Amino acid sequence: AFEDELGAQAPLGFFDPFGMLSGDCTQERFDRLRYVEIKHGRIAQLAFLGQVVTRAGIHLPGSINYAGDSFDSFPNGVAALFGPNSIPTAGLVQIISFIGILECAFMRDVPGTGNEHVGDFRNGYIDFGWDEFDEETKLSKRAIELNNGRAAMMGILGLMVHEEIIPLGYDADLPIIGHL
Amino acid sequence: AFEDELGAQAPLGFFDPFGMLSGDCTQERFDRLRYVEIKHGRIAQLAFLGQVVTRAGIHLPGSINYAGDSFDSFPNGVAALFGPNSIPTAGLVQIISFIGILECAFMRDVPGTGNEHVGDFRNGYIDFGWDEFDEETKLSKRAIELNNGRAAMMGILGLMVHEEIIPLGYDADLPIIGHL
Amino acid sequence: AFEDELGAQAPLGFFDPFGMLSGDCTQERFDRLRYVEIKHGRIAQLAFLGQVVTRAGIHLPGSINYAGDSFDSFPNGVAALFGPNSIPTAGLVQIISFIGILECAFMRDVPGTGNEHVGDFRNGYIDFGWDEFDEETKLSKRAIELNNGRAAMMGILGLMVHEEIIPLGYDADLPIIGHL
Ligand code: CLA
Ligand code: CLA
Ligand code: CLA
Ligand SMILES: CC(=O)O[C@H]1CC(C)(C)C(=C=C/C(C)=C/C=C/C(C)=C/C=C/C=C(C)/C=C/C=C(\C)C(=O)C[C@@]23O[C@]2(C)C[C@@H](O)CC3(C)C)[C@](C)(O)C1
Ligand SMILES: CC(=O)O[C@H]1CC(C)(C)C(=C=C/C(C)=C/C=C/C(C)=C/C=C/C=C(C)/C=C/C=C(\C)C(=O)C[C@@]23O[C@]2(C)C[C@@H](O)CC3(C)C)[C@](C)(O)C1
Ligand SMILES: CC(=O)O[C@H]1CC(C)(C)C(=C=C/C(C)=C/C=C/C(C)=C/C=C/C=C(C)/C=C/C=C(\C)C(=O)C[C@@]23O[C@]2(C)C[C@@H](O)CC3(C)C)[C@](C)(O)C1
Ligand code: KC2
Ligand code: KC2
Ligand code: KC2
């Protein structure tokens, strides 16, 4: 039933190993799964962009504290949030609070606003020209977003794992990025 | 749609900053939110009453243990539940178990019993004369309960925060209640 | 309404102390409760069987690690999973991952497959002859499964509690099984 939905493309086609959509799956279940997948993909895309920017030597100009702790002095990766040399716990809690405010008020599907598909948070408020695209281009953009999100999920998991296995003696000369 | 419901009164009117009810919000969502708000308000009202009674020097007569630990020897506030001089862990676990029994059996909206609104746990079992009040008086009582609950939420949050910031050097001469 | 459902047997009859099905309880709520009860019963039956087999001196032949840690060297009970002499954390995490894979993909009620009642995971895939039984025998088998599951819930709780109270000085010469 969902073998022709978004995300079922070449070369794998419809790829449902664990069988979430097996049987007479309801549209609500697939909508929930696609919402979770798109949310994870967007978060992972942002996380991968952040690690790429930070690890390349690009840091915000200034100090993260009144104490003078410069932005470009903190480590990259999980060591920047959780560790002995991480950013202050106040900064992490404020970041989490901002993300929670976004979750509750901003990055949500408001019913009866004009949203067209799962993951559309536009809400008739912030539109950059979605209606300019025709249907085929719209589907292509949605598929690109979803697949880049899956790739970012895998990449961010790999980056965190590789950073975490370095103290254990598992230091890998990763391609392109190099040593973490 | 919910701008004329209970709790939207002077001077703020309908106050929905985070936009929980924005858009075509369903009645189920508002009922869930109002249930959570009323439950929190009742819990916080009881918590503030407990704070006032305990901090005023009124303690239960006797001892909380067979070992002879008197009721009036334990501290007030968070130090009475979680701390080195708190009540015995068995007492806290029994309190939590009693509250869970209440949650699962007593303080619940039993369907098909005669409940009139969200937060009405009466269940046609314990009534002190609710039907004696007229509709306007009923609405006034419900609004009083809700607003006192919100005030108690903020007050209990303030009391816990002020108790917790005292060891950090943030001791404030609070009005009325004084030093915690 | 649910006083004649499965699980209401002599001598207790319909036993609903906490009043979970009191009032106009929907079939969905009873179905959820029965699903949870059957799942817990099956898990507890497996846990009791495994703990009895392990405590009887029957262990898998070989070693659980490449390091040579034999199966019959680990303790019995909670000390085998969580403790200073437990199985390796890798083994526990892999067991949890296998159970999660089962939860997600295998031990589930796939809609539109032919399942006849709550707790039926057969899904028209693995059938040993369920249709051979008549209606009364089917009800008897389901009731036996449910009641043995409740008995196993109590038994596994008792086994874990008795194992945990031994270091505290509460060592009980339990009947049949003896000292844990
Ligand atoms: C998962 C996302 C994520 C997370 C958790 C972090 C976390 C962190 N970043 Mg970071 N970053 C990210 C994405 C992320 N970043 C992206 C995508 C970029 C590229 C622009 C950067 C660029 C960046 C720089 C240049 C620096 C950091 C730094 C830091 C650290 C200090 C916090 C700070 O100043 O943030 C700053 C965050 C930003 C500048 C960009 C955040 C953008 C977010 C993800 C937007 C997402 C919500 C957005 C409002 C949605 C808009 C919707 C639209 C319709 C309006 C902290 C560990 C600093 C550091 O290393 O100090 C220790 C630092 O110097 N980051
Ligand atoms: C959030 C609610 C709450 C919580 C968590 C606590 C927690 C505590 N209180 Mg306390 N207390 C509360 C509310 C609360 N109280 C209220 C509202 C009052 C005013 C009557 C008191 C009066 C009070 C005294 C006088 C003493 C305590 C003490 C204590 C401590 C020991 C436990 C004990 O003996 O409880 C005793 C609890 C009570 C005497 C009253 C509890 C009543 C609860 C809130 C009823 C709520 C559910 C109820 C069944 C609903 C009925 C619905 C109706 C339709 C039937 C413990 C830290 C003792 C202490 O400090 O020793 C260490 C102590 O001496 N409390
Ligand atoms: C709650 C269930 C449960 C749990 C958590 C454990 C946990 C454990 N068992 Mg164990 N065991 C169980 C049930 C369980 N067992 C049952 C039911 C039996 C009887 C066959 C055994 C027999 C057994 C032996 C003989 C040994 C262990 C050992 C161990 C320990 C090492 C892990 C291992 O080798 O597993 C091995 C697990 C098994 C041999 C059987 C597990 C079978 C599971 C329960 C199947 C459940 C799902 C299944 C696929 C459903 C199929 C449905 C069907 C339609 C296809 C570990 C603490 C070993 C030990 O103590 O070394 C430290 C050991 O030597 N167990
Ligand atoms: C004005 C304003 O405020 O906002 C607007 C601005 C604008 C532009 C309109 C908006 C937008 C669009 C945005 C932000 C789009 C972002 C898209 C983004 C960020 C897309 C890539 C993600 C990451 C991927 C694919 C990672 C793959 C990672 C992969 C495939 C790996 O496995 C990788 C790997 O590393 C390992 C682990 C090991 C090494 O071998 C190295 C490599 C690399 C191989 C917003 C959102 O509307 C907000
Ligand atoms: C027979 C039996 O068993 O039961 C029946 C008995 C009976 C009577 C019928 C029943 C009832 C009704 C009850 C229990 C009603 C209770 C109502 C209650 C308990 C109502 C106030 C709450 C707290 C508020 C408003 C706090 C505000 C706190 C505020 C506004 C603050 O911010 C405060 C502040 O402190 C700071 C943090 C700093 C300092 O500057 C000091 C102050 C104070 C300014 C029940 C429930 O049906 C059960
Ligand atoms: C081919 C393949 O791969 O799979 C198939 C194989 C097969 C056979 C078809 C299948 C099956 C059926 C199975 C596995 C059925 C299992 C049934 C099972 C395991 C049934 C008892 C549970 C435990 C009870 C009742 C415990 C009570 C415990 C009680 C009553 C206590 O309180 C006890 C106690 O200890 C205390 C705490 C203290 C002491 O005084 C000692 C005692 C004992 C008194 C499956 C599932 O379809 C999978
Ligand atoms: C996530 C987004 C975000 C938002 C929306 C946001 C809003 C506000 C507002 C509201 C207008 C104020 C008034 C405010 C004030 C301060 N912020 Mg924010 N802040 C955010 C993020 C961070 C991070 C990451 C850090 C940080 C800090 C500080 C410090 C320094 C305190 C000090 O130096 O003792 C002060 C005074 C740093 C800190 O925590 O220092 C321990 C630091 O690391 N903030 N901040
Ligand atoms: C929340 C409500 C509540 C209920 C409904 C409830 C019911 C019962 C019943 C059932 C009829 C019994 C039989 C019972 C028995 C004991 N209770 Mg309760 N008890 C409640 C609350 C507390 C608190 C707060 C404490 C406490 C204690 C004890 C001790 C002392 C043990 C000891 O001194 O070794 C014993 C023997 C104290 C304790 O935990 O001491 C470590 C203590 O702090 N109990 N209790
Ligand atoms: C729950 C079911 C389950 C499944 C489905 C499953 C699948 C696979 C697969 C996939 C085909 C591989 C390739 C694989 C391989 C290894 N397993 Mg499994 N394994 C399961 C259970 C356990 C347990 C309980 C233990 C264990 C272990 C090891 C070790 C030893 C590593 C070492 O000696 O360093 C290796 C190499 C032991 C261990 O973790 O040792 C620290 C141990 O305790 N495994 N295992």
From TrEMBL, chains A, B, C:
Positions of chlorophyll a 1 binding: 15, 34, 37, 40, 145, 148, 150
A UniProt-annotated Pfam family: Chloroa_b-bind
Highest taxon listed in the record's lineage: Eukaryota
Annotated residues for binding of chlorophyll b: 42, 86, 103
Gene3D superfamilies from the UniProt entry: Chlorophyll a/b binding protein domain (1.10.3460.10)
GO cellular component, one term: photosystem II
Residues annotated to bind chlorophyll a 2: 39, 103
Intracellular or extracellular location(s): Plastid, Chloroplast thylakoid membrane
Swiss-Prot/TrEMBL GO biological process terms: photosynthesis, light harvesting in photosystem I; response to light stimulus
Keywords linked to the UniProt accession: Chlorophyll, Chloroplast, Chromophore, Light-harvesting polypeptide, Membrane, Photosynthesis, Photosystem II, Plastid, Signal, Thylakoid, Transit peptide, Transmembrane
GO MF term list: chlorophyll binding
Residues at which chlorophyll a 3 binds: 121-122, 128, 145
Family annotation (PANTHER family): CHLOROPHYLL A/B BINDING PROTEIN (PTHR21649)
Record-stated family: Belongs to the fucoxanthin chlorophyll protein family.
Protein task: The light-harvesting complex (LHC) functions as a light receptor, it captures and delivers excitation energy to photosystems with which it is closely associated. Energy is transferred from the carotenoid and chlorophyll C (or B) to chlorophyll A and the photosynthetic reaction centers where it is used to synthesize ATP and reducing power.
Protein name: Fucoxanthin chlorophyll a/c protein 8
Upper classification of the organism: Eukaryota, Sar, Stramenopiles, Ochrophyta, Bacillariophyta
Encoding gene (name): Lhcf9
